[model samples]
Target chain A: RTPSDKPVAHVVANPQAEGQLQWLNDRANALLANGVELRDNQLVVPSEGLYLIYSQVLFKGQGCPSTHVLLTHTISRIAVSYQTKVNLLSAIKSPCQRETPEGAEAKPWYEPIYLGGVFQLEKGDRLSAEINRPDYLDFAESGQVYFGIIAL
Target chain B: RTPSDKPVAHVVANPQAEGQLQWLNDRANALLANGVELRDNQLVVPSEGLYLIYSQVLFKGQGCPSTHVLLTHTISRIAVSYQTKVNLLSAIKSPCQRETPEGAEAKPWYEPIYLGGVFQLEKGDRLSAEINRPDYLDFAESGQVYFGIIAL
Candidate 1:
């Protein structure tokens, strides 16, 4: 039988300032130096199987944390498939009702959340994700967002 | 010696409309029914090492492909560190010639074109690459992202 495959993960962090690219580079280098491999610009487990993923954020400057981290898992080898949605309302529960342009009071707009779990893969199976500011924050300036994933 | 640990990867897609959740659940179940395992809401490979990641936007309404795909690899048993920066202007190339309230335009704010590479666990240590987005249109929606990794 073919060897079981491993999972792929990404690390996203706001560098706080422009010069912080070096910091990000340093972190990436450290992962490479240790034994992690990169495919298509991100890191991947060298073998196949189950693994654990962890993520954290470090804040700088004088504002609320505006950066977002997206952890994507790609499954390959198998003809796996799934569904998707768009322009949905937020599921976050808040103390007060949020208002919309049409005067509808409800939760804020939807921001993707963790629906974590296990996934299977076949040969040539693949998966991936992205991290960025939400559409509602279009007017605001960009902020730092950081993240990373590891396989076990 | 202790067995080397593996890495874990995660993926989640938004199904913007009602009833779509069932489709996602069916997909997840299908994955589990196969060899894939689910942990904390994510799919897991039975072994460790390199694996490919794949995600897709299955359905969307009018004017929207409503569907898209992203792929990446996840690395396992890795370590990461952090660095900090002060100003966004210093590190980024200005996009404009003049220094206005909007800041210099000579270097525009952007992520490093190439983030980093992968490392190996055995002898002959070398670095590898991860993938990146090919176009902006791929990210133009509220649903769909995938991830995976290949263990060497």
Candidate 2:
């Protein structure tokens, strides 16, 4: 098969603060091509094969009230056969760099986590991304937070 | 097309401590399949198409002496047509979570940075991964640090 005929989908971040990541599917550089579909917050698999699935999320935080601030980015699969959600990849990141010096106030910080792998999928499988803290996510830049998959 | 025919490569980490990362291309789960080739520390392109390239690096530090520790992971492309290297994806992480409490001894910490994306490539293009501090990298687990690419 030619490259143009391959199934591919890329979803960028949407500012909506939801448990499951909301994506911009119709924007420039965001796509659903060659039978790939975006249903709700998941990318519906079109055929059975191996695919290179990838995601990246940028986290932002200010005024560290606690000693640590942890954020999680997870890629999950909802398969038809199992009828359950399976986590494919996950990253737990501690975004807080340092404690406030003496009585000084906390400053803003930004960090990013990226995860990707090749996995086999059934035709009816669905792939989705979830974040623990949507309020701390940076959704202003499309390149900073995105989820994409390409059929091999 | 069957997934088996797709050009794919997965290279695990090798503890060499070089500026550019050294990969284990001949080990278990490490592969150069269907015309993908590894030359020096870079993966040579087999055909012209879009490829999903991904990499992850786990960093470890025994004790924190400074206020902060910064590390960078970069994926670069040396294209034949361009005759120069271009950075495709990069992540800069401050691995040092916090400074040691005034008199207390610092403890060990671990952090990971992952970056990936899909890009168009030419037949003679070369892809490589680089890290700023090789000594701080954890190469004990192949699953922890890896570079992989799959043709779309």
Candidate 3:
């Protein structure tokens, strides 16, 4: 183990890629430092103690169905040593309630969901954002949809 | 100068909250531990090598008016000796737009904004939420709105 003094990693949702949850492939949108690893859209823990895992999913509507649109953004992890998987944080509640200005419907409506929490992970724990539906996510060029973990 | 081996602090929007873009008041809303200090609502940098600053603002609305409510969340810092203040992260875009399930409107609506990043801070530097409006934030018993910094 490298002691992981400054172990940190960040990744974004890459539109060109596809995964179990439409998550980004790390090769293109990743910052791995101090022994943190990104594999198969999952952040592999190096020397985990207390790590803060976070994710933000920005949703933009294409056309209106006038029905309900629910966006679930979550930080999930699997501890290889413990042989178990768990949800660190889940912002399943609707993040988009209307407060828009008049005549602004022409612009693509957006709902941003941010969820994060502290976790006690093991050395081999794996972390990633649990994306159920990829279509509701806006993979913007501005790093609007992001996921990151910091070892503290 | 003392070494900040485990310097960390976590603060929530104390019912009266707002964000960077005035949200910090730190004397009323911060949790200091392992050598972290709060004075005048700014986290006085302790050990000061590199730190990860983070913030999340949760907004809840009552009955719906059809308007795009905007929520801007930002984490900023200031270095006393270096004479610099920087914005670590800012999520200014709207979180979502929606159609909801029938009768779901009876409950309070939620819109949360989250942003965080890493920075190099000196020992005497300080930190705070980039606040604007306080009433728009939800300081629920569940600890919805949060802010913090961790020395790395």
Candidate of highest lDDT = 2
TM-score for the B chain of model 3: 0.70
Best by DockQ: 2
Q: Each model's C-alpha lDDT?
A: 0.28, 0.76, 0.63
Ranking by lDDT: 2, 3, 1
Per-residue lDDT over B38-143 for candidate 1, one digit per residue giving the tens place of the 0 to 100 score: 4423344444334443222222111112133232222222211212211111111111222222221111111111011232222211111222232211222232
For every model shown, the clashing-pair count is 133, 0, 22
Candidate 3, residues A36-143: lDDT per residue as tens digits?
Answer: 777866888988589878777666664344445566777878888665668788876453345532443443566666777787988888987876667766653435
Determine which window of 10 residues in candidate 3 chain B has minimal summed lDDT: B16-25
TM-score of 2: 0.67
* lDDT per residue as tens, model 2, B99-133: 53455555677878888787667697898888888
Candidate 1 is scored at a TM of 0.29
Model 3, backbone clash pairs (residues 3+ apart or across chains), number: 22
Write one digit per residue (lDDT tens) for candidate 2, span A99-150: 4444544444568877788999989899987788887777545356788888
Model 2: DockQ score: 0.18
Off by over 4 Å in 1: A1-35, A38-40, A51-116, A121-128, A134-144, B1-30, B33-152
Over B80-115, each residue of candidate 3 has an lDDT whose tens digit, in order, gives 764666544556544335443345665566776667
DockQ each candidate and list the results: 0.07, 0.18, 0.17
